[PDB]
Design a protein around this ligand. Structure first.
Ligand code: DHM
Ligand code: 3OM
Lengths: 159, 155
């Protein structure tokens, strides 16, 4: 018998995530205009379908692009996805606030690049949201006069 | 199992805007002066100040702004930005900030705003795990990009 099945419940970790660091065996991939110079926005984990949806932004040819990638889990425990080639992604460390991952990418020219990354989650607690809504109500502010800055197209550019 | 000692200055660092509400919608609409995307906050217990770093779009473009608020005896803070402001912290912890701001502009018009901000926390052990994995893969330190500081200092 090899290893045994892993009880996986990551649905909980879905939400807004941000890129902290990304390292690469090939600097070109993460330098300005590189395909893996990715600013994460959101991650959605589905435990039933065994997938992870990645939502991030990348600058290409002087233009900003919003990308959506779907990764599928394997018996291996790793995830596979198509993006600037084929990718095999492993979650090395994971908690309610951080994710440390390792990714192997093989581009259309058979070139292999290994990347490491650290992402952090932007956690918004129910207790704090309640405090905000009560205060907002106390000041007579209408719900329609509240702006969501976490999920909004019009935002600053990191570069 | 250990946690850093609690210090007001320990709250300093990258912060992000979640929600901002206004009694006057125009102040937070596109090109409004209070449609502020936070970058960093620096708290100074000694001086009784809070330095705000944020970005706001004006005339079609993003501007990086810095504002220094000074604490009063009653615990509230005062700051100069698009008129006079009196800022009150309603709730504050290692991960969140809920505040109420009263603004009176150059025309004597009063606007009250509410906001919810969250801190981006990067733990020591998580950074160590990242660097260990990075060295395990033979990746040179110069081949690592800090995305967080890029977002904290946009253009
Ligand atoms: C360490 C992660 C790299 C930087 C991004 C890979 C994202 C994916 C899943 C689309 O291949
Ligand atoms: C006066 C300083 C500003 O950063 C206050 C922003 C208040 C948002 C509710």
């Amino acid at each position: 018998a090899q290893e045994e099945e892993a009880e996986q419940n990551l649905s909980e970790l879905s939400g807004p995530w941000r890129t902290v660091y990304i390292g690469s065996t090939n600097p070109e991939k993460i330098q300005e205009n590189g395909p893996f110079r990715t600013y994460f926005r959101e991650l959605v984990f589905d435990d039933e379908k065994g997938t992870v949806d990645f939502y991030f932004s990348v600058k290409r040819d002087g233009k900003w692009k919003n990308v959506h990638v779907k990764a599928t889990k394997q018996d291996d425990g790793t995830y596979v996805a198509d993006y600037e080639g084929q990718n095999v992604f492993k979650i090395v460390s994971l908690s309610r606030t951080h994710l440390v991952a390792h990714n192997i990418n093989v581009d259309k020219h058979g070139q292999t690049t290994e990347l490491t990354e650290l992402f952090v989650k932007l956690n918004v607690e129910d207790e704090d949201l309640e405090k905000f809504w009560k205060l907002t109500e106390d000041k007579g502010i209408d719900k329609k006069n509240v702006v969501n800055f976490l999920e909004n197209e019009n935002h600053p550019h990191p570069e």
